[PDB]
Write a protein that binds this DNA or RNA. Structure first.
Length: 1326
RNA sequence: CGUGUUCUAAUUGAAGGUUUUAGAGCUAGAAAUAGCAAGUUAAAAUAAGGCUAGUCCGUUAUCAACUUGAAAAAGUGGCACCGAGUCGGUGCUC
DNA sequence: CAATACCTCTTCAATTAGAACACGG
DNA sequence: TTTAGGTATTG
């Protein structure tokens, strides 16, 4: 006789229970435990809060990291295992010192000095070769045998930090001189293209190409010197290509299909080559000439140093950085001595202040130290060039800085190679292992290979040819690499909804194509002059149509049918076709795709070869990497010409279908012995449809399927709640709410509800890049003209201006950067139709009156001027298809009366699909009973509501919701949603299809919805009491019921249950604190004394436990008795459970009482004394446990007082509210007294409270809007949970935390329900 | 069907940061002190660590209590009424 | 004791897959 | 992107 309404949010879940007259019931419960009480009475409405659920994204980037960090450790491992024999010969302990290089001299086992043991020599190496990049030049240059331990020393370093694989190819650093290389291209292109010459013109190609200027520009700067060549003309692309780019010369050679080329991209050498043959072999020389330049320029940025001396340029730049520090370090210090020597300690000796002494020795970034000395360099004189260097960002470079990592790995490998080549003569073992050693630097598992697991990884999927250990060297052979690649993908791709078991067919499969075609053809009707009835296409006719027309054309069209087949074959001079649009919707595209590739039409037609064409496409869809693609294209390799095969690889396919293969031809109807495809070709008689067939009872197809949906019988609840497409947090809630219902029903005597009413409610650097790119494609200097910062664009009217590129969207005029305030944000589509605050639906222009009518999308006039302008933006990606299409809409007829009706509806019916399964799951769990007909006995209605019913209802009925005041409102919001949705479908059963779960003309529809919520009101002239005119049933009573709502709303006691959740996650703050004399510090590794070595700190605690036990005090070690809290940290927790006592004793608690220990999750609740209540938060601290049941009038009063966004109300009413603000303006004192009395009673943090009071007291003069909003601020001290910062108008009130758990220890412990209804109460004295 | 954004799940890379150690500091001066020279680099751990010993796994999800289960998860607590500062009383069942 | 006041690893690359959602045709 | 438990500091 009751109904349950619930609110499901990210962090909260609101529930309620309602009588037959919208009252809320009031039951007396039991209370297990030792306390005197044996029952308590509580209301039937409330909310269960919790911590927001957390996504796996951080955890995965950890998952990734750990797999990542160790592999790098492994590379440093293979060098040693290569080296071990020859290193012991040379040195016994070199490797041992390195492993133990970290340990303290006292704990050091071998000689402290890693490289040579001796103190004297190590000093020597460090001063001939002071930075490891001074050593890296030597052994790529020197032709004199060198100490092996220096050689390994070089090698690991490159391997440990190796360079990025963004670019894959081979680099011959014979490319140092760009000018020479470029000029050589001018030559070979002239020879190729005698007719139109190029003249070199003495461009500082090295100078032009070399420069930092943006990549697109340089090719422009180069073509600005040429005498009159087009940018995109053949030369231009080539030039553009060497510089990293993906130009296109398809337009100069008019290839039918676009021919795009990246040197960097893996698919280049063939790609040009696959292309190159197609333009003649002659050019091929031209591109290589281009690559050779690319190599010389490509590396240009790492070193501008003359190539000619050095075969190891990259390392050389670092030596250069070192020198350019030194003299600028002498000259700075020297200059400071020359001027302002007095302030010289701060700059160098003192770490704290960002001084150079800070820079080397303190936590001072390169950007933190450059902006410290900025005044000083400027203040100083004789420093002028120095200034220039810094502005360049070159002032005092360090060898490791954030940027490196635009160093490709192929010079780090360029330099590994030089060393081996250099010294393999001295040492035979290198030539034996040069390949291995290079392979260590070279080798990266691909993504599709996955973790090299052996059956123990939830994550990994690879499969093994040989079970021997995998080493970079043996890799291809051990891993079933291709097969593994098909495994990568076949776990993230779909299964048929109809058939769970069969994995979905790829999109470009011929069979889907013979299915789509034969299906769209099944319902073609045709008529001619002679016939009585227009009739279906016959089986003979369809096959004839598919074979002739479709197999001959990509697209088959209506008059292709009329004249090509009927006239040619059936000779109907003229015909009428009912079935189709201008052309058939499907096409036999894949059939056509192939015909071009292999040119054997009968082959495609032949049935026997048909499983090849699906295992061609399943392999062509399935794979990304062209080398990978080849492997399974060998299996069918024998038949085709070699020339085709090369062609075959290129046309890769994408996307996947929804239909399987046993469907389309998989299953056979028993009586008719035909599969759907069979059915589709030749069904009739009548030509049945896929949909039809799947519901033809006469047919077995529905029946057979029936088993398929059933198999596995669904899955248990979280197994299902964790597969719904949505927020991780939202799913957590979805679960929690059902755990509420099964109680609320359990509570209501296991009596199922009449109605269950559900609601759900609804970047800093992202803005920077999108603009960054957009201007670049646009090429405007507007970004240059005015620059801005990454922290600035959370303000739209600023941010919008940039996407619009400083021009009026509706006006074609430039914009005032400074006075954005005068201008107006305009939402393209009016808010009344839809509520959109997105960058997608907003625009900024001076006046929002130039778009057009208030009541429509931007006017035809607006589109005409700037439709074109809107294209530059879309291409720039400065706007979007959603943003664009609406903007251009008006020429689409804009918003029809049909459109408007649609928006007004969607405000009220929830179409959000995440809120659907949730609705569905309730119905399924709730209604299990089955009637004699297959039909379902729906005994609980489910209802989904949009927020706007309830949110508006408070606005129009004096039920205002103030979020800040109490955590209660989340619970009122079920109640309202309960009675709203119950009373709705008691007046309009017709809407039950829309509002409840289970199976032009618009203008009126607009009316039907807009006024739907009228009936509650007395005047809009409505009768007080509502009814169903059909059933003669009462639904509403304006007088009695409204009063009831107020009675429910202001109820003093609501159930508010912070979920007790055990803490999880990282053990402690990731930061590694320096060695300290503290027992707080945690030893980073099991041997490493943090007093000695440093450690972590700040461990989080998965749950605390009360030990009532004894410890010894004093020399006597007398055993006293304690009862304290011991938090068990998350490192510790695993250890605890194996045995607590042994673990507990270890801490030193003695004669621990085994039975007494009680696990306490974070957020546990104790009520001590006055009814002041507290939630555990950490072992040492507790949280505000109390809620404020503010009498409503104060709740109502404030909402108006804050006066949010001024007033949105209808004008006459606004007068009505205001007097009451100041009739009851004295209420403000009432509120403070309410906080003031309560704060004294429960919050119990007086030291602050006087402080708070005073702020209000001296601000009595200030207006209510000011004072009024702020009192709302002041609620923050009050609120359930943990202290945070807050202020009155300018006065900031710091928090007061609760610093020990002692006061809990002889107090009541409350273990409540998932609802707060059932409790068990524990008086802690013992 | 086409397209596009957004968000989620997985995999495989790069660059910094941090932490002890190694880069013979000197000149005075009994000393705290005070004069100047030096600084740019490397090694190593990078969740403690687990057994299934992999170039594997190690921060998501799920969690009142009590009886019971390995775990999953099943089982446990009268009703009415009048009233309201976090549930208080009444009558009834019991 | 419990009042104040500081601290909290970061920023980039590449590849697949699928909902969900909103424009067009 | 800011909270809200851990840390040692000062009165």
């Amino acid at each position: 006789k009751y109904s349950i309404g619930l609110a499901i949010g990210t962090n909260s879940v609101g529930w309620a229970v309602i009588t037959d007259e919208y009252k809320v019931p009031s039951k007396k419960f039991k209370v297990l435990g030792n306390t005197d009480r044996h029952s308590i009475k509580k209301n039937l409405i409330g909310a269960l809060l919790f911590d927001s659920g957390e996504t796996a994204e951080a955890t995965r980037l950890k998952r990734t990291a750990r797999r990542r960090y160790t592999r790098r450790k492994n590379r440093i491992c293979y060098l040693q295992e290569i080296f071990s024999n020859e290193m012991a010969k040379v040195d016994d302990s070199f490797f041992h010192r390195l492993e133990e290089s970290f340990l303290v001299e006292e704990d050091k086992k071998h000689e402290r000095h890693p490289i040579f043991g001796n103190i004297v020599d190590e000093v020597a190496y460090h001063e001939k070769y002071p930075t490891i990049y001074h050593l890296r030049k030597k052994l790529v240059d020197s032709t004199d045998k060198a100490d092996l331990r220096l050689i390994y020393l070089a090698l690991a370093h490159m391997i440990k930090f190796r360079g990025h694989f963004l670019i894959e190819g081979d680099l011959n650093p014979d490319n140092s001189d760009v000018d020479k290389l470029f000029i050589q291209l001018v030559q070979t292109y002239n020879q190729l293209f005698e007719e139109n010459p190029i003249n070199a013109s003495g461009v500082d190609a090295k100078a032009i190409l070399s420069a930092r200027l943006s990549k697109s520009r340089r090719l422009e700067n180069l073509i600005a010197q040429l005498p009159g060549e087009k940018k995109n003309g053949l030369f231009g692309n080539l030039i553009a290509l060497s510089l990293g780019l993906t130009p296109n010369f398809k337009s100069n050679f008019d290839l039918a299909e676009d021919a795009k080329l990246q040197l960097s991209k893996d698919t280049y050498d063939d790609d040009l080559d696959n292309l190159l043959a197609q333009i003649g072999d002659q050019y091929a020389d031209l591109f290589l000439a281009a690559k050779n330049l690319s190599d010389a320029i490509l590396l240009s940025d790492i070193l501008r140093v003359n190539t000619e001396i050095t075969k190891a340029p990259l390392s050389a730049s670092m030596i250069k950085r070192y020198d350019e520090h030194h003299q600028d370090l002498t000259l700075l210090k020297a200059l400071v001595r020359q001027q302002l020597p007095e302030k010289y300690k701060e700059i160098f000796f003192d770490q704290s202040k960002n001084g150079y002494a800070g820079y080397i020795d303190g936590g001072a970034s390169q950007e933190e130290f450059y902006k410290f000395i900025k005044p000083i360099l400027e203040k100083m004189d004789g420093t002028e060039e120095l200034l220039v260097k810094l502005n360049r960002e070159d002032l005092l470079r360090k060898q490791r800085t954030f940027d490196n990592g635009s160093i490709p790995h192929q010079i780090h490998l360029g330099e590994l190679h030089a060393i081996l080549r250099r010294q393999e003569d001295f040492y035979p073992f290198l030539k034996d292992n040069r390949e291995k050693i290079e392979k260590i630097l070279t080798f990266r598992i691909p993504y599709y290979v996955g973790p090299l697991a052996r059956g123990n990884s939830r994550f990994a999927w690879m499969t093994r040819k040989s079970e021997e250990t995998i080493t970079p060297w043996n890799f291809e052979e051990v891993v079933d690499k291709g097969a593994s690649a098909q495994s990568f993908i076949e776990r993230m791709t779909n299964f048929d909804k109809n058939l769970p078991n069969e994995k979905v067919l790829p999109k470009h499969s011929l069979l889907y194509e013979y299915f789509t075609v034969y299906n769209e053809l099944t319902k073609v009707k045709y008529v001619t002059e002679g016939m009585r009835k227009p009739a279906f296409l016959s089986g003979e006719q369809k096959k004839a149509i598919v074979d002739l027309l479709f197999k001959t054309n990509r697209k088959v069209t209506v008059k292709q049918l009329k004249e090509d087949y009927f006239k040619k074959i059936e000779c109907f001079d003229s015909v009428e076709i009912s079935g189709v649009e201008d052309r058939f919707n499907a096409s036999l595209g894949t059939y056509h795709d192939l015909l071009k590739i292999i040119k054997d039409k009968d082959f495609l037609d032949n049935e026997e070869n048909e499983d090849i064409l699906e295992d061609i496409v399943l392999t062509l869809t399935l794979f990304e990497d062209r080398e990978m693609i080849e492997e399974r294209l060998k299996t069918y390799a024998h038949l085709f010409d070699d020339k085709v095969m090369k062609q075959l690889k290129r046309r890769r396919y994408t996307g996947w279908g929804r239909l399987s293969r046993k469907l389309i031809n998989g299953i056979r109807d028993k009586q008719s012995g035909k599969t759907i495809l069979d059915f589709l070709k030749s069904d009739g008689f009548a030509n049945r449809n896929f949909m039809q067939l799947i519901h033809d009872d006469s047919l077995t197809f529905k029946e057979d399927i029936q088993k398929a949906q059933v198999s596995g019988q669904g899955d248990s609840l979280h197994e299902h709640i964790a597969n719904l497409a949505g927020s991780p947090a939202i799913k957590k809630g979805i679960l929690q709410t059902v755990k509420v219902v099964d109680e609320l029903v359990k509570v209501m005597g296991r009596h199922k509800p009449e109605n269950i009413v559900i609601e759900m409610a609804r970047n800093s650097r992202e803005r920077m890049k999108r603009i960054e790119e957009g201007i670049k494609e646009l090429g405007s200097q507007i970004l240059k003209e005015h620059p801005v910062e990454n922290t600035q664009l959370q303000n739209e009217k600023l941010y919008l201006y940039y996407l619009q590129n400083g021009r009026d969207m509706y006006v074609d005029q430039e914009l005032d950067i400074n006075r954005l305030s005068d201008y107006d944000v305009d939402a393209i589509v009016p808010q009344s139709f839809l509520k959109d605050d997105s960058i997608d639906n907003k625009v900024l222009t001076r006046s929002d009156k130039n778009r057009g009518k208030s009541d429509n999308v931007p006017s035809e006039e607006v589109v005409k001027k700037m439709k074109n302008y809107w294209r530059q933006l879309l291409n720039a990606k400065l706007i979007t298809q959603r943003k664009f299409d609406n903007l251009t809409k008006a020429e689409r007829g804009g918003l029809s009366e049909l459109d408007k009706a649609g928006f007004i509806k969607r405000q009220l019916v929830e179409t959000r699909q995440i809120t659907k399964h949730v609705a569905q799951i309730l119905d399924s769990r709730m209604n299990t009973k089955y009637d004699e007909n297959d039909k379902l006995i729906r005994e609980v209605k489910v209802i989904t509501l949009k927020s706007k019913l309830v949110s508006d209802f408070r606005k129009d009925f004096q039920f205002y919701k103030v979020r800040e005041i109490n955590n209660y409102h989340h619970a009122h919001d079920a109640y309202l949603n309960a009675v709203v949705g119950t009373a709705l479908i008691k007046k309009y059963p017709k809407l039950e299809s829309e509002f409840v779960y289970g199976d032009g003309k618009a203008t009126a529809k607009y009316f039907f919805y807009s006024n739907i919520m009228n009936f509650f009101k007395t005047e809009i002239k409505r009768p007080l009491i509502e009814t169903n005119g059909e059933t003669g049933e009462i639904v509403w009573d304006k007088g009695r019921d409204f009063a009831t709502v107020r009675k429910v709303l202001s109820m003093p006691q609501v159930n508010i249950v912070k979920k007790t959740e055990v803490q999880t996650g990282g053990f402690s703050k990731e930061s590694i604190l320096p060695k300290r004399n503290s027992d707080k510090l945690i030893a980073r590794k099991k041997d490493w004394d943090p007093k000695k070595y440093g450690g972590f700190d700040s461990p989080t605690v998965a749950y605390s436990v009360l030990v009532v036990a004894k410890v010894e005090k004093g020399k006597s070690k007398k055993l006293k008795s304690v009862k304290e809290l011991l938090g068990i940290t998350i490192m510790e927790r695993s250890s605890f459970e194996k045995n607590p006592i042994d673990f507990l004793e270890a801490k030193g608690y003695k004669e621990v009482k085994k039975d007494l220990i009680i696990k306490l999750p974070k957020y546990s609740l104790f009520e001590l004394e006055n009814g002041r209540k507290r939630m555990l938060a950490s072992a040492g601290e507790l949280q505000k446990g109390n809620e404020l049941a503010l009498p409503s009038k104060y709740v109502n009063f404030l909402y108006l007082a804050s006066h949010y966004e001024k007033l949105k109300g209808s004008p006459e009413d606004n007068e009505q509210k205001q007097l009451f603000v100041e009739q009851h303006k004295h209420y403000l004192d009432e509120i403070i007294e309410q906080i003031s009395e309560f704060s004294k009673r429960v919050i119990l943090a007086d030291a602050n409270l006087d402080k708070v009071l005073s702020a209000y007291n001296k601000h009595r003069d200030k207006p209510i809007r000011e004072q009024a909003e702020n009192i709302i601020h002041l609620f923050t001290l009050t609120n359930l949970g943990a202290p945070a910062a807050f202020k009155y108008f300018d006065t900031t009130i710091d928090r007061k935390r609760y610093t020990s758990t002692k006061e809990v220890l002889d107090a009541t412990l409350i273990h409540q329900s998932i609802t707060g209804l059932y409790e068990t109460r524990i008086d802690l004295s013992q």
